[PDB]
């Protein structure tokens, strides 16, 4: 069995009667999930996986694009020199777990090695016909509704010395975030101060451990800070909830100066800058009522500041980032890879 990238197909637990858009797309593009999913282990054998050059990430990317294309239709869309006007009805939008499976003659290799940084050899290796249930959550800064690491916090980067390589963080304890909108564009999220400082404490120390172990970059203390620039989609924690686009200020989350919870002032926008293509999409005004989303902060997207020449200092600054939704997919597709029989 040799490595290959074939033509995967999707499978989900979507319902035929559901009006929600993820269920509607998955009903016509996918199949019913495996009632008894087999996972045959492969003992006395090891093999290497690479999450950063995985074609499974690219397939999930363009599927979520076509999902967003036919689901969240904007009123006016500006792409290139063309203006695309279309109907923009208010829809119900909530992601569901999606499984990716290998066609006839192929299989998927799953690595069950605990504390796996994304690359290198794997002792625990099993074969599955499908992945696990992955919610295609499109978020920024904070990875929501993802999977948790069984051991400590795991730090993933294709090259930790490259400051352009975004660092994908995967938490071990979920940080519950409660966003709500009772100005019909003013919302706010609430997050417990105790659990966020505790998780931040464990993430800072894990960043220090992985840089002291695998990198020649040495620093005494780890420090966070708000992003230095960019569009509002990445300078804030941007996500989708009930069809509306939320832009939440995370300055309080990444403020070093540290009572119950932490309140993040949000803002719903009608004009967003799309992630699936280059252009802006104008959506309809928000719907009335109490719009509430309770999600799990399961991961972080961070970039490291450029080092000073001939300097190191006791402090290294990390900042939340986002934009490329491929990193959101490989935060779950890291353990899987396609094999050919």
């Amino acid at each position, epitope marked *: 069995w040799e490595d290959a990238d074939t033509t995967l197909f999707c499978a989900s637990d979507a319902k035929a009667y559901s009006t929600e858009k993820h269920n509607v797309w998955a009903t016509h593009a996918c199949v019913p999930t495996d009632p008894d999913p087999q996972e045959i282990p492969l003992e006395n054998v090891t093999e290497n996986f690479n999450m950063w050059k995985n074609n499974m990430v690219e397939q999930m990317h363009e599927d979520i694009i076509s999902l967003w294309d036919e689901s969240l239709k904007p009123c006016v869309m500006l792409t290139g020199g063309s203006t695309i006007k279309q109907a923009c009805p208010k829809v119900t939008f909530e992601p569901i777990p999606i499984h990716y499976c290998a066609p006839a003659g192929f299989a998927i290799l799953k690595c069950r090695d605990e504390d796996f940084n994304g690359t290198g050899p794997c002792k625990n290796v099993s074969t599955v016909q499908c992945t696990h249930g992955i919610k295609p959550v499109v978020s920024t800064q904070l990875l929501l509704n993802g999977s948790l690491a069984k051991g400590d916090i795991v730090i993933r980067s294709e090259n930790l*010395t*490259n*400051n*352009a*390589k975004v660092i994908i963080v995967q938490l071990n304890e979920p940080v519950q975030i409660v966003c709500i909108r009772p100005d019909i564009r003013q919302a706010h999220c609430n997050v417990t101060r105790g659990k966020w400082v505790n998780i931040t404490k464990n993430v800072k120390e894990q960043l220090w451990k992985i840089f002291n172990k695998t990198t*020649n970059i040495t620093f005494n203390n780890t420090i966070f800070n708000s*992003p*230095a*620039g*960019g*569009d509002l*989609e*990445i300078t804030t924690h941007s996500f989708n909830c009930g069809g509306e686009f939320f832009y939440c200020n995370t300055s309080d989350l990444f403020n070093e100066t540290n009572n119950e919870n932490i309140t993040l002032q949000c803002r719903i926008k009608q004009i967003v*800058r799309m992630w699936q293509r*280059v252009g802006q999409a104008m959506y309809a005004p928000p719907i009335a009522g109490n719009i509430t989303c309770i999600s799990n902060i399961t991961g972080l997207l961070l*970039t490291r*500041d*450029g*080092v*000073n*020449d*001939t*300097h*190191d200092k006791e402090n290294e600054t990390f900042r939340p*980032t*986002g*934009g*490329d939704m491929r990193d959101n997919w490989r935060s779950e597709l890291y353990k899987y890879k396609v094999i050919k029989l």
Partner: antibody
Amino acid sequence: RAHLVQSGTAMKKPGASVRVSCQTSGYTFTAHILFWFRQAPGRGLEWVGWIKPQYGAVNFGGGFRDRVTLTRDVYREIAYMDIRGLKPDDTAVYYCARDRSYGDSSWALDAWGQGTTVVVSA
Amino acid sequence: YIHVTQSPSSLSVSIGDRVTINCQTSQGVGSDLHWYQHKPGRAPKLLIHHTSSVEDGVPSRFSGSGFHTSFNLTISDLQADDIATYYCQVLQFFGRGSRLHIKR
């Protein structure tokens, strides 16, 4: 195919500000990181910062974060570099360069702007 | 921080000679090493990317080599157009350069 054109030379006084533009053409603008390098007279090239033109995510080398602003215009496919609080030590030739990899960061700069001379003198 | 050291600083060359300059790194690099040609009054030009992969448009005489902490740029048959400075780069760390002039 990929072409990067910058702005002309800049005459500045110590403490003033300078804007250098970088017009791109012939390639997908938002799919290649734009780097900014400067070369002081008699010294080597030094990195000051890059920008990912998709959403404008930026990073800087040590020291430049305090007074350099990297921006871009996605519609017109043009990047900008703003430097405030100019010192005489900032007299150098500034380059904007394009990463060769599509949607990746290899630091291999294949397309270069012609350069912009900035001289900070009293 | 990664130190980049090039040698020699300046080298005497004759038309048609086999030239080889060295690039050194303070730590294990591996492969993502890039070489550039720089003539006065113009922008630097990418010659080799990733140790040995030659960029499109570069003449066949150029060739890169090396591993870990030592890398070499090689010109098989030098011509008049090849008289310039040559940098080696890794991440944001450029080398100070190796200058080439005609020997008489």
